[PDB]
Amino acid sequence: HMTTPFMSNMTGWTTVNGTWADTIEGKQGRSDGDSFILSSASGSDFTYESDITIKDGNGRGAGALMFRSDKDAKNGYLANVDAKHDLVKFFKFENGAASVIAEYKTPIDVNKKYHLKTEAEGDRFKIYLDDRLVIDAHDSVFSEGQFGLNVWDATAVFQNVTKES
Numbered sequence: 001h002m003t004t005p006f007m008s009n010m011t012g013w014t015t016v017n018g019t020w021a022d023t024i025e026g027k028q029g030r031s032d033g034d035s036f037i038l039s040s041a042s043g044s045d046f047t048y049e050s051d052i053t054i055k056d057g058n059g060r061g062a063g064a065l066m067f068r069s070d071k072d073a074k075n076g077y078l079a080n081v082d083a084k085h086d087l088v089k090f091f092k093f094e095n096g097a098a099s100v101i102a103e104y105k106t107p108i109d110v111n112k113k114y115h116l117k118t119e120a121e122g123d124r125f126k127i128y129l130d131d132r133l134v135i136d137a138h139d140s141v142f143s144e145g146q147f148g149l150n151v152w153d154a155t156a157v158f159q160n161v162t163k164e165s
């Protein structure tokens with residue numbers, strides 16, 4: 001029977017762009033720019049988390065959780081680990097244009113598993129890196145939408161991708 005090594009409680013994964021696959025390590029994405037995959041799962045308030053490992057390829061950029069997204073990932077929130085810029089970023093896309101909401105600055109590495117967790121509750125967003133709170137910010141732009149994953153100028157692997165509402 002069909003099985004995948006990607007572990008998640010979410011289904012319906014639809015590739016927006018980039019190169020996305022399920023490998024023995026998890027769901028891998030790669031692109032030089034931003035690229036996105038969206039689950040059919042949707043929500044408003046939730047805990048959304050994943051293991052994220054940035055690999056050697058492309059520009060050793062970033063891997064991200066995306067949430068409260070529209071169908072083509074043009075509008076939504078992201079929380080990432082960015083090895084190139086050494087930060088955890090909470091940001092939004094509005095009609096395909098990015099703007100930063102909050103950051104935590106820390107050295108971020110390639111070939112190191114990170115655990116990233118977002119708790120989205122109304123207009124408040126708490127982001128944890130390896131179980132430590134690093135961002136606790138407010139933003140009112142988006143209230144609901146799809147869950148997904150992103151990479152920016154990176155190859156990255158996502159494993160144990162889960163949401164709880």
Ligand SMILES: OC[C@H]1O[C@@](CO)(OC[C@H]2O[C@](O)(CO)[C@@H](O)[C@@H]2O)[C@@H](O)[C@@H]1O
Nearest residue numbers: 034062080082089091098099100151152
């Ligand atoms: O952290 C990666 C994440 O950063 C974004 C949004 O800040 O921008 C990437 C990169 O693009 C520019 O805006 C210009 O090319 C730079 O200022 C920034 O380093 C997202 O696009 C990406 O997912």
Ligand code: NA
Nearest residue numbers: 007008009010
């Ligand atoms: Na599954």
Ligand code: NA
Nearest residue numbers: 083084108109
């Ligand atoms: Na780095």
